[PDB]
Amino acid sequence: LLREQFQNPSDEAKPWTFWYWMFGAVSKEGITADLEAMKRAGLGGTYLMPIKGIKEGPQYNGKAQQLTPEWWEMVRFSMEEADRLGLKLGMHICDGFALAGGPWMTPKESMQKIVWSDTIVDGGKIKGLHLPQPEAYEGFYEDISLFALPVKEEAADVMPAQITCANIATGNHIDIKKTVNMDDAGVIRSSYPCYIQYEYEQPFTCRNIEIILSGNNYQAHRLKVMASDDGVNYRLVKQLVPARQGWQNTDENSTHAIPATTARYFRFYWTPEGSEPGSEDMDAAKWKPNLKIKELRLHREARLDQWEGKAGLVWRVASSTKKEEIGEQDCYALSQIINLTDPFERTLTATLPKGKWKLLRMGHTATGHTNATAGGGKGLECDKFNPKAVRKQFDNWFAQAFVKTNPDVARRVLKYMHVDSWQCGSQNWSDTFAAEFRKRRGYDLMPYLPLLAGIPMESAERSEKILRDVRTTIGELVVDVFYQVLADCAKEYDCQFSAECVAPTMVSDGLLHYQKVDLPMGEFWLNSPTHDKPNDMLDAISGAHIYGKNIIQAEGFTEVRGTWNEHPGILKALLDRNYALGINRLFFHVYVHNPWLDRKPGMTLDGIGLFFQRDQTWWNKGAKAFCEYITRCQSLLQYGHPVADIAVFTGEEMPRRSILPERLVPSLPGIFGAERVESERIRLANEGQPLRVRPVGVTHSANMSDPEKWVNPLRGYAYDSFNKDALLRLAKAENGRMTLPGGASYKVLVLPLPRPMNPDPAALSPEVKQKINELKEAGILIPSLPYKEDDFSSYGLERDLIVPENIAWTHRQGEQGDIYFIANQLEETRTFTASMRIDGRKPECWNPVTGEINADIPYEQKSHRTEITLTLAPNESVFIVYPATGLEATEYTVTFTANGKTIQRQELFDWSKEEDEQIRYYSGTAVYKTTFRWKSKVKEDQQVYLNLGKVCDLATVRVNGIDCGTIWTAPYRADITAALKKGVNELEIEVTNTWANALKGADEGKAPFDGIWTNAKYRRAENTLLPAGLLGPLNFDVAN
């Protein structure tokens, strides 16, 4: 029954934590203390993951380097203690937090890429010729083919150039030293509009520019190319366009094609005007809009536009190459190419026709990626397309946890196998790739292998059709090999399989892998706009919904710079909007193991939060009460199936992933509303490229999308993104709706306009065209775009929930009835109407903070909907469920637990404004004791609240020794009804703040007690003491 799930939730409803072991510094005494704290807070389990080793942190004197006998003894003891306490465990598939590496992997067994070497020679008879050796990682390299291409032009690929620059920006304060300049090594820097000029001795013909960088630089890809024969009259060649790109973009340079241009002078003009704001698919646009280029390489030999990404070496999306850029005469036919593979530190002997020929020697080598955050378990990443390599990774780490510990205990407690978010670049080859390509795509890749160096063949269109097939195959192999093999291994060891995202680092369909896993998992960050991953969150939730996975996990509260002012009151709105998106099992990031019992707050992940661990000031009472709210919420939010009326198709480009709401605004302007259309015009215009600092010390693009401003963006409908695999393999028409196994059922199917991640757009395959037609004939609404009405009520599809803005919500339904989660996102008390798409059933209001149920709230039935009036306090949330006078106190005694000080006061006070330093700089818990008089006996159906006024930051209330609650969020009041008596009552309130004030104290030689230490170095920029204590005033509230 719903009422007993809410009141006595199951173990599946409890949140979990990540548990990080730092630098091999681990102790048994800390393990016991940590696991007991976790059990007392009400967590269900933890994922044990060690991060770095003694080399990275020698000062900590760690005795538990990964994979040593001493380390395995800590893992065994942890398992033993988890069993005693009734907690469960998981571990990741490698040391560190990403991804699938270890010291047992050789270069041959690691991720592979196609590499090559060039040389030009005269034809006729060739004899014992040595060829240049391609890139070989640690000396590993293997030949595949050797091609001979008849040169298109005899002139050289590059020529010498005199390089100069010129500032063109005028007026006002222009820091003259930040105008364009070139250093000793040729590196070009600028913060103001400028040109860079290349002068050739004789006219040069340029077909593309290879842009080479030091790190990332969005602005480098926005140059405007101009050319001149006479040194004064210049003509426009091309405005360059940045390719879509993710945070791991540095493994390859970028080639921008132009129309073939013969000139003595090339000018590259730059301005920051017209820049796009940062996002997950233009990651470098997050950073300051300054220009920085290591080298521009102007090439003569023809190449496809942005080929590095199109060959799958790196995660990128760009437009197909225009005919103006690569025409018939720029491509090679198959009959022109002479394959010299058969003719054998090797040499070549054979004979060519007369003329000059390019000797293109192709092969493969390792990409060079490692599980970089590992300690003892660090080495090369496994080949993701090789099933024996993938199995080997499993056997050498995760499988060993059932052998090198106690095997019977391991089998009871270690029930979860995790793979985290991908951080190992991309790969475009393996020994099996040709054959896999052959079965799946229906033709041979091998004669076309020079496409993977960007050398065009037959036509531009034909070259790019095949390169898309290479990319498609890459993504298919991530799922059918790496995930498939790991899923077999997990089932063999009786483990559940959780996984986070593959996008935006590895070429993939970002949703596709979620079919092979039990527990899709997303990520959401606290106070970290440059590192948040809302598109990851939508990949995991969309994947779960379309592939029928009921439990959706999330790595929550990850904080790029923690500053020790975080407590549960300021985490609630963040959590609730991610519940509205559709997660239902939270994993806290992060609980770090503190091996010392006399250092507080102790060891952290170099100051990366959330600092969620036993030595937090608010752990004992605050972590517990938060986790109780979380468990009540998650009991209802795992019930039944989620409701979503709209499916949005993710297309046929590669790579691909779920679609962010902002990118749908041009398709559905009516649904989003005019105010959203207008605010988006202004944001994307991005006038002045404004900067924001958040957190302390992280300067970034101010107009980047903020997920807090995208609550209920379709104004009462919900959507999932939806891929070709689900369309072709799972979708079925039933009663005018598109259904999928596991409970998804959509009335609308959107085929969005061309968009930044699908700009061509990629043509729909005949099979996709066929299924869409079928679904349309069966009653599924395929709207005509742009869709301009406010909603879909014209077609019989009303909004699910009608509420005002800044109200986050979700809807679940099953045999026992319907549930709406409704949450206030503002720091304001608000009263509003909520209108739900439910006809003639009685609603109830269930309160997740307190566990109270009000089964008889007022409501009105109107036009076959149900309306209620809700009052929500700041950040307050509620579930709507449908079945099928001043205090007058004596002298306060206030006792500061951590340092034993006690004082006597008549009036309440802010700790941070006291003259005594041991109070002024205090962080921790203080116990207030007083008495008050109650006039009359408590009547029947009379309810009394003690209102606490302003609490900094949480308070537990006790009346005549009876616990009346831990108060951590609005409204700040406790129900004292049952504890009251006539006469004098005893009043005790325990109040706890955050660590900020004590750390500022300790930093300045004014620590308020002994034993303060942390490796977390970041602090609030403001340099102020925060408000602290029970500020009041205290008041009674009597009602019925």
Q: Which residues are annotated as a binding site for Ca(2+)?
A: 420-421, 500, 523, 555
Please count the other Cβ atoms lying within 10 Å of the Cβ belonging to residue 418: 24
Residue closer to Br ion, measured from CB, 14 or 221: 221
Q: Are 311 and 454 in contact (CB under 8 A)?
A: yes
Residue closer to Ca ion, measured from CB, 420 or 953: 420
Judged by beta carbon distances under 5 to 8 A according to partner kind, the member of Ca ion, Br ion, none in contact with residue 484 is none
Q: Are 551 and 608 in contact (CB under 8 A)?
A: no
Say whether residue 506 binds Br ion (CB under 5 A). Answer: no
Say whether residue 755 binds Br ion (CB under 5 A). Answer: yes
Say whether residue 825 binds Ca ion (CB under 5 A). Answer: no
CB of 659 to Br ion, least distance (A): 6
CB of 454 to Br ion, least distance (A): 18
Residue closer to Br ion, measured from CB, 294 or 755: 755
Stretch of 418-426, 472-480, 643-651, 793-801 contacting Ca ion, by CB under 5 A: 418-426
322-361 residues in contact with Br ion (CB under 5 A) are none
The CA distance from 612 to 567, in Å, is 9
Residue closer to Ca ion, measured from CB, 537 or 738: 537
* Residue selected from 457, 757, 898, 1028 as contacting Br ion according to rule CB under 5 A: 757
Residue closer to Ca ion, measured from CB, 245 or 421: 421
CB of 787 to Br ion, least distance (A): 17
CB of 87 to Ca ion, least distance (A): 22
Please count the other Cβ atoms lying within 10 Å of the Cβ belonging to residue 141: 16
Strand arrangement, sheet containing 732-734: 732-734, 737-739, 745-746
Stretch of 349-357, 421-429, 747-755, 897-905 contacting Ca ion, by CB under 5 A: 421-429
Structure tokens, 716: 């009462």
Partner residues linked to 365 by β-bridges:
113
Helix or strand (DSSP H, E) at 776: helix 766-777
Judged by beta carbon distances under 5 to 8 A according to partner kind, the member of Br ion, Ca ion, none in contact with residue 663 is Br ion
* Residue selected from 117, 133, 167, 216 as contacting Br ion according to rule CB under 5 A: 216
CB of 316 to Ca ion, least distance (A): 22
Residue closer to Br ion, measured from CB, 663 or 811: 663
Say whether residue 421 binds Ca ion (CB under 5 A). Answer: yes
Residue closer to Ca ion, measured from CB, 373 or 993: 373
* Cβ partners under 8 Å of residue 742, min gap 6: 547, 548, 549, 550, 641
Stretch of 148-156, 209-217, 433-441, 742-750 contacting Br ion, by CB under 5 A: 209-217
Fill in the per-residue mask, 276 to 295: x = in contact with Br ion (CB under 5 A), - = not in contact. Answer: --------x-----------
Q: Per residue in 840-879, is it b (16+ CB within 10 Å) or e — as a string?
A: eeebbbbbbbeeeeeeeeebeeeeebbbbebebbbbbbbb
Tell me whether the omega of the peptide bond preceding residue 655 falls within 30 degrees of 0, making it cis: yes
The residue whose two tokens read 């999306």 is 317
Helix or strand (DSSP H, E) at 862: strand 860-862
CB of 557 to Ca ion, least distance (A): 12
Give the burial class of 1010: count Cβ atoms within 10 A of its Cβ; 0-12 exposed, 13-18 middle, 19 or more buried. exposed
Judged by beta carbon distances under 5 to 8 A according to partner kind, the member of Br ion, Ca ion, none in contact with residue 542 is none
Say whether residue 58 binds Br ion (CB under 5 A). Answer: no
The CA distance from 182 to 162, in Å, is 13
Residue closer to Br ion, measured from CB, 452 or 665: 665
Distances (CA, A) of 395 to 287, 399, 402, 721: 41, 5, 10, 35
629-668 residues in contact with Br ion (CB under 5 A) are 663
The residue whose two tokens read 């302007």 is 669
Phi and psi for 497 in degrees, rounded to 5? -115, 110
Residue closer to Br ion, measured from CB, 754 or 1032: 754
Return the residue nearest Ca ion (CB atom).
Answer: 421
Nearest alpha carbon to residue 45 among 580, 414, 478, 361: 414
Phi and psi for 750 in degrees, rounded to 5? -100, 130
For strands 962-967 and 1012-1014, give the pairing: unpaired
* Residue selected from 353, 690, 756, 883 as contacting Br ion according to rule CB under 5 A: 756
# residues contacting Ca ion (CB under 5 A): 2
- Residue by residue, DSSP assigns 468-506 as HHHHHHHHHHIIIIIIHHHHHHHHHTT-EEEE---TTTS
Fill in the per-residue mask, 868 to 907: x = in contact with Ca ion (CB under 5 A), - = not in contact. Answer: ----------------------------------------
# residues contacting Br ion (CB under 5 A): 6
Residue closer to Ca ion, measured from CB, 421 or 1015: 421
CB of 970 to Br ion, least distance (A): 38
Which positions make up the binding site?
A: 420-421, 500, 523, 555
Say whether residue 271 binds Ca ion (CB under 5 A). Answer: no
Say whether residue 365 binds Ca ion (CB under 5 A). Answer: no
Residue closer to Br ion, measured from CB, 454 or 1029: 454
Please count the other Cβ atoms lying within 10 Å of the Cβ belonging to residue 935: 7
Give the burial class of 496: count Cβ atoms within 10 A of its Cβ; 0-12 exposed, 13-18 middle, 19 or more buried. middle
Helix or strand (DSSP H, E) at 773: helix 766-777
Stretch of 25-33, 257-265, 414-422, 835-843 contacting Ca ion, by CB under 5 A: 414-422
Say whether residue 371 binds Ca ion (CB under 5 A). Answer: no
Stretch of 248-256, 283-291, 416-424, 679-687 contacting Ca ion, by CB under 5 A: 416-424
Helix or strand (DSSP H, E) at 46: strand 45-51
Say whether residue 973 binds Br ion (CB under 5 A). Answer: no
Judged by beta carbon distances under 5 to 8 A according to partner kind, the member of Br ion, Ca ion, none in contact with residue 471 is none
The CA distance from 665 to 439, in Å, is 39
Q: Secondary structure of 218-253 in the HEC alphabet?
A: HHHHHCEEEEECCCCCCEEEEECCCCEECCCCCCCC
* Cβ partners under 8 Å of residue 655, min gap 6: 315, 317, 471, 475, 503, 504, 507, 508, 509, 510
Stretch of 332-340, 415-423, 673-681, 798-806 contacting Ca ion, by CB under 5 A: 415-423
Residue closer to Br ion, measured from CB, 640 or 752: 752
Nearest alpha carbon to residue 592 among 1015, 90, 990, 294: 1015
The residue whose two tokens read 């006729």 is 124
CB of 398 to Ca ion, least distance (A): 18
Judged by beta carbon distances under 5 to 8 A according to partner kind, the member of Br ion, Ca ion, none in contact with residue 421 is Ca ion
Judged by beta carbon distances under 5 to 8 A according to partner kind, the member of Ca ion, Br ion, none in contact with residue 284 is Br ion
Residue closer to Ca ion, measured from CB, 421 or 969: 421
Stretch of 260-268, 692-700, 750-758, 1011-1019 contacting Br ion, by CB under 5 A: 750-758
Tell me whether the omega of the peptide bond preceding residue 342 falls within 30 degrees of 0, making it cis: no
Say whether residue 847 binds Br ion (CB under 5 A). Answer: no
What is the sign, positive or negative, of the torsion defined by CA atoms of 537, 543, 546, 550? negative
CB of 654 to Br ion, least distance (A): 14
Residue closer to Ca ion, measured from CB, 501 or 955: 501
CB of 555 to Ca ion, least distance (A): 5
The CA distance from 562 to 611, in Å, is 7
List contacts with Ca ion (CB under 5 A): 420-421
List contacts with Br ion (CB under 5 A): 216, 284, 663, 755-757
